[PDB]
């Protein structure tokens, strides 16, 4: 068995989309409000997240068939999956050695306590770190990592979606690509596809925990003022 | 002639209010998104302005009688006068030597071209600089500088004000203090009170120019996203 021409184009276009939207030098980080170590990390992390939301939008626009969807459907998918894509893409900076995200210099080496100093609790950080360790151990190929993010983004089971029949078709077409990629190109990937599909289930509960914690944060004007207009809009509850 | 006990209390309370809300070390400036020299200065200036809006709110709360007003009236006065207080208070960092605002290190030495690189035109910068040079030459006492800002903030001729009879009383009581302060404590201040009242007229046209320019800026989502939630709220058009 081997990958069709169409499936190969999907992989190439996604890898190039990731490459365009993920800067491995983390150079743009010096333009955010600086890290400070009561809710001292909120400005830097609001800025980091906002910058990432822009990247996820840029990536989504290059997922074949996403641009063809309704602006409304595109918004619904982005609003509900943005945080999950942030969690997934952050794995590229997550290191098993230090159990932290390392983004450039010594100032952008982020421990779990930083997220604590940014309005979040161990209820979110316990499974976020566990999710990162679990995902890091899968030693995903760039093709799988990028495919998983596109499967996640194209989940039709999102609140707000209208043409969910078209979205389910896009996602299944992408899963066929992943399942085959593993089969043909990943030695000892017998259990991988399932292991990755389970990682999408973990993202849902992590989405849920973040949402609760963010609601509490966003309801305090003294904190919501430290957020950015894009973060407010994307994590907000408007329809 | 000499100042009453009541008028002296007004001066003391205002000077202390200014001292609490104006940090002469400009140390907090390192916490803003950094200066970058298309609309490269917008993040740093959005942050600088937002920080100043917080200061002006802190100051206003210590102006005798302001806290006693309606939350609505307090908002109306703040929304329409905030930019004028920013313009007034910025004079403390304005230098006649370099024709720029000098706030701490070499990175917070701001020339007129910086405001240009932040979405504003020479239609605003020509009179802003002229206003600063004119105000700097008045060599105002700290008492006069602080009194002028409180007169400006307590202008009852603002869109949105309700109990404008009470506000006009507060302002007139403050003008009596200024007029007397100059008379008794300022040698050669024969024309000063009038010269300062004229500076309030200049602030209105500068308010007007900024408002036009800000509307143009805030109407472009790619730019409004670079602003802060407080700036959006204060310079916004909600009632």
């Amino acid at each position: 068995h081997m990958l069709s021409d169409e499936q190969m184009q999907i992989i190439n276009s996604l890898v190039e989309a990731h490459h365009k939207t993920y800067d491995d030098s983390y150079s743009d980080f010096v333009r955010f409000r600086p890290p400070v170590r009561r809710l001292s990390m909120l400005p830097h992390l609001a800025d980091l997240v906002s910058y990432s939301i822009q990247k996820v939008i840029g990536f989504a626009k290059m997922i074949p068939g996403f641009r063809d969807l309704t602006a409304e459907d595109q918004i619904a998918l982005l609003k509900s999956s943005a945080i999950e894509i942030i969690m997934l893409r952050s794995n590229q900076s997550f290191s098993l050695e230090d159990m932290s995200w390392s983004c450039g210099g010594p100032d952008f080496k982020y421990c779990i306590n930083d997220v604590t100093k940014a309005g979040h609790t161990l209820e979110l950080l316990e499974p976020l770190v566990k999710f990162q360790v679990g995902l890091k151990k899968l030693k995903l190929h760039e093709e799988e990592h990028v495919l998983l993010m596109a499967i996640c983004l194209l989940s039709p089971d999102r609140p707000g979606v209208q043409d969910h029949v078209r979205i389910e078709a896009l996602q299944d077409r992408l899963c066929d690509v992943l399942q085959a990629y593993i089969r043909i190109q990943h030695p000892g990937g017998r259990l991988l596809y399932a292991k990755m599909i389970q990682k999408l289930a973990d993202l849902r509960s992590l989405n849920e925990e973040h949402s609760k914690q963010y609601r509490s944060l966003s309801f305090q004007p003294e904190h919501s003022m430290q957020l950015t207009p894009l973060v407010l809009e994307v994590f907000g509850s408007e329809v | 002639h000499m100042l009453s006990d009541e008028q002296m209390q007004i001066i003391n309370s205002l000077v202390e209010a200014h001292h609490k809300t104006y940090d002469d070390s400009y140390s907090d400036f390192v916490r803003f998104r950094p200066p970058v020299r298309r609309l490269s200065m917008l993040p740093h200036l959005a942050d600088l302005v937002s920080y100043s809006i917080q200061k002006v709110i802190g100051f206003a709360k210590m102006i005798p009688g302001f806290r006693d007003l309606t939350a609505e009236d307090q908002i109306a006065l703040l929304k329409s006068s905030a930019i004028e207080i920013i313009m007034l208070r910025s004079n403390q960092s304005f230098s006649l030597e370099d024709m720029s605002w000098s706030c701490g290190g070499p990175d917070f030495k701001y020339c007129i071209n910086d405001v240009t690189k932040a979405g504003h035109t020479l239609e605003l910068l020509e009179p802003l600089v002229k206003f600063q040079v004119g105000l700097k030459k008045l060599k105002l006492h700290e008492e006069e500088h602080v009194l002028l800002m409180a007169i400006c903030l307590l202008s009852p001729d603002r869109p949105g004000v309700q109990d404008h009879v009470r506000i006009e009383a507060l302002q007139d009581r403050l003008c009596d203090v200024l007029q007397a302060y100059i008379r008794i404590q300022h040698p050669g201040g024969r024309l000063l009170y009038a010269k300062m009242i004229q500076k309030l007229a200049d602030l209105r046209s500068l308010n007007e120019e900024h408002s036009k320019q800000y509307r143009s800026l805030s109407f472009q989502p790619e730019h409004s996203m670079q602003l802060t939630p407080l700036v959006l709220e204060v310079f916004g058009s909600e009632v």
Partner: peptide, 9 residues
Amino acid sequence: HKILHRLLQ
């Protein structure tokens, strides 16, 4: 969703 709309071109 002003910003999202713009960001999506």
